[PDB]
Hints:
The protein is an alpha+beta fold. The protein has one helix at residues 28-42, and strands spanning 6-12, 19-25, 47-50, 56-60. It has a four-stranded mixed beta sheet, with helices on one face. Strand 3 (47-50) and strand 4 (56-60) form a beta hairpin. This is Immunoglobulin G-binding protein G. It comes from Streptococcus sp. group G. Binds to the constant Fc region of IgG with high affinity.
Amino acid sequence: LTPAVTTYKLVINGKTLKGETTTKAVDAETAEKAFKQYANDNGVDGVWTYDDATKTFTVTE
């Protein structure tokens, strides 16, 4: 969830290690699209959705 024009956070559960990156969005949808673009490009697209247990976003395989 992104209130207005704020930044959101996204964690990648890569393969063995996990790292965090962030991006800015307007609405939750916006955030997802931006984060997805980046992760898709790379090649990590399985379970790609968000977290509401510390307002982060996440991608797992």
